[PDB]
Amino acid sequence: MLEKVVIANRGEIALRILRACKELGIKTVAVHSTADRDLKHVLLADETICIGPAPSAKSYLNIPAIIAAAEVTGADAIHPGYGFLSENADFAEQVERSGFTFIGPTADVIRLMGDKVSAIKAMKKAGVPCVPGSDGPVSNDIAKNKEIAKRIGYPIIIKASGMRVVRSEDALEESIAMTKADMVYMEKYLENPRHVEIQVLADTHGNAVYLAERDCSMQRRHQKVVEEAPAPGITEEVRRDIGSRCANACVEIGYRGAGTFEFLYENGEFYFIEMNTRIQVEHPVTEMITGVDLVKEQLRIAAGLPISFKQEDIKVKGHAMECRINAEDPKTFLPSPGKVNHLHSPGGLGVRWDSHVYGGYTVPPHYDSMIAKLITYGDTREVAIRRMQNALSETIIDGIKTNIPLHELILEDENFQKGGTNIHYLEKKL
Amino acid sequence: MLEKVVIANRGEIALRILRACKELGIKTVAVHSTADRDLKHVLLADETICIGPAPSAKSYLNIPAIIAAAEVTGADAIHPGYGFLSENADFAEQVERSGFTFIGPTADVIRLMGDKVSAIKAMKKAGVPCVPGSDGPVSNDIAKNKEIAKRIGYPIIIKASGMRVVRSEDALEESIAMTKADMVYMEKYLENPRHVEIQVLADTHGNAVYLAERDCSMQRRHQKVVEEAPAPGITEEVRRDIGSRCANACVEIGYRGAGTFEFLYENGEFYFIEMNTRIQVEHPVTEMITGVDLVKEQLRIAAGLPISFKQEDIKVKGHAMECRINAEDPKTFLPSPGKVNHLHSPGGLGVRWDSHVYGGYTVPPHYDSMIAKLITYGDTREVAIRRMQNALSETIIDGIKTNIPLHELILEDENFQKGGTNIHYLEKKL
Ligand SMILES: Nc1ncnc2c1ncn2[C@@H]1O[C@H](COP(=O)(O)OP(=O)(O)O)[C@@H](O)[C@H]1O
Ligand SMILES: Nc1ncnc2c1ncn2[C@@H]1O[C@H](COP(=O)(O)OP(=O)(O)O)[C@@H](O)[C@H]1O
């Protein structure tokens, strides 16, 4: 089975993966750039290998260096985390071709869902509901493109298969032509949707389960800020419908490992936009409400084992929230690298802290600005929110700026308190 | 209802109580000694009052100063935490007589269960199983005392109603006489029992529930070191039997609030030794396996509300462990006050940290040596243990000594791994 795993990532998710490995008795190899020698998980790892200089291009995106690390350590598998190479099919392909297990789906499936048009085709075949659209690429025969847009209904949106709006017909031709500058398709533009996403696991034993959903509508510049689970307004009946369509889609496409079907959710209907073929940042809210350890399931599935429970075993209990704590100015969102002189992290009942940051740690400039994920749980959404407010008020990060004040403004917002705000709400508020 | 609570305690439990209050929207008054100005919960409290100098006698045990604090702030209630005045019936009596709600049972009931002989009588009446004993005080008519010991069966143990062994008859008279030097009783001496204790809540609406049990057998000098829940070997049938006898005992005696029935557990049988009429240090392991917030229930019950669930609503899930992290030498157990230069606390899935300690905090000499409670949860006892081992390995407390190495030796012990070690096991190992 799996005895040694290369953690092909950094920061909090690398620590998250190390903790799972260690619980399973799996040896760890931390590959790291020169700037990340002092990462917590590196310092805890059984073996360490420096795979390149600070810039991502020359380290965490360095495919031959990472594979070479697995080779020299005699590792069995490589966990890509999220970001970086986790949805890079060329990397997955090279990892498997080199004799190692990729902790993720097969390369073919990454490619399939990595292309918007082919992704949508597969979902459509599987019976997962999709945004009404061209169902395939557009030409630039304009008469035909105008017919289709008319069918779909304005406003429509032109989109790269690998993003421009049209609110009227006279704008369509040039709207399309210029968007190409690579293939393009068009679909309905949904103006006030929420972001609701279903977590799944599928194994090599023909099993696939769904683990409720998360609402990730609080976003800025298409970057998630606060996530929660379950999604408000969603009943168990709706959950079982959309959920079950997602699990069967996993089977049809031969999915393997953890993944997420992301939807735009509007007036009661789900509309597919993306499958993330990897673990996601916000996975912990789902863990809190289901009792599943998603990274541990990733490792088991990669080793050949079955998912460790059945669909009927999972029952949503309570509610959970996650605030992404970033080292950035809370107003300008300019990054704020530098030394954390003191960290005081919060705790108590229903509080979870996922972070690689520690007193004396220096947040570098080279990567993203995430320093911690603060996650709370309660019997009710209301309790999870109050618990989050209190945990944030206790949290002290000294020496750099953080977006904690932004989280505090979100949590006390009367519309957020009610729940169900849409994906444009945060940008408007600001 | 309750709008303002005086937290008549310090350290971690004072922080625990503040967090519950704040979740409920209840205003807080932190009473503190001169040495505790810099306690985390003091720094978070809505109001602060210095009730005296460093020594316990002149601060946290100062009844008129604490009551005076409730008076000047117009507080509604006083939460005694554990230790200090929490089982002092004169304090409870004075608090109620002064117009404030005591968050705890009535004074009469504290007195009842504060005396070993009357406690045992009440349990016996309620049908809670007790150690075979004299059922009342001994005289020093020696012929009669010898008859009773013979009935009970040696070895027996002579005990103060407010502790000497006898293994044979010829030692009994002088064993008794000298133990008085205050009333005395005698009961069976159990040589290899475990410490297993049942958590209850009882409200002012005639309800009483049991929340499974905890095993606290890992002890040194009668001080608990590691606690877990549920207790290994205990089936749901046994749990419901002993549990239900405990809840009905609450009703018979008119119990109010949180409490614990402690038993010595041997060859399948429970034997009552003490009711703690207060919240206990180790309450969080029960929270992790039941989903109940015990301090929040204490506050609700004190305000007049019903317990917020029914017995049929509680179902034990998973397993939880707690290590009491103390500032002391791990070998000599000599206290280790002084400045914590850096704290790095652990986290991730299934890890809970209850501590008032922070980087730059100075642990004082005047009180106990507890600085944190590290609590883990898992689907199985095995997962909880491994999670605890990993969390301890991540924990860094710099500038003072701690008993973390003791916890690490306990957790890796093959007998502990199996489970069910008795109350003498740790002292022997050392
Ligand atoms: N049909 C649609 N209606 C409205 N907005 C859309 C639609 N399709 C995509 N979008 C916008 O584009 C975003 C996706 O952009 P993209 O860069 O592909 O991110 P991701 O990789 O998360 O899909 C969505 O969050 C949404 O705001
Ligand atoms: N019948 C008994 N057999 C063996 N040990 C006993 C018995 N009764 C009491 N003890 C010992 O005395 C301890 C209780 O001492 P005490 O100072 O009263 O602490 P507590 O307040 O927790 O009861 C028990 O943990 C146990 O070790």
Written account of the structure:
The PDB classes it as ligase. Two copies of one chain form a homodimer. In chain A, helix 4 (89-97) packs antiparallel against helix 5 (107-114). Chain A folds into three domains: 1-85, Rossmann fold, CATH 3.40.50; 86-130 and 190-430, ATP-grasp fold, B domain (D-amino Acid Aminotransferase, Chain A, domain 1, 2-Layer Sandwich); 131-189, 2-Layer Sandwich (Dna Ligase, domain 1), CATH 3.30.1490. In chain A, 34% of the residues lie in helices and 27% in strands. The first copy, chain A, has 430 residues and is of the alpha+beta class. The A-B interface holds A 15-16, 19, 22-23, 40, 44, 284, 287, 291, 293, 317-318, 342-345, 347-355, 358-360, 379, 383, 386-387, 390, 393-394, 396 and B 15-16, 19, 22-23, 40, 44, 284, 287, 291, 293, 317-318, 342-345, 347-355, 358-360, 379, 383, 386-387, 390, 393-394, 396. The structure holds adenosine-5'-diphosphate (2 copies).
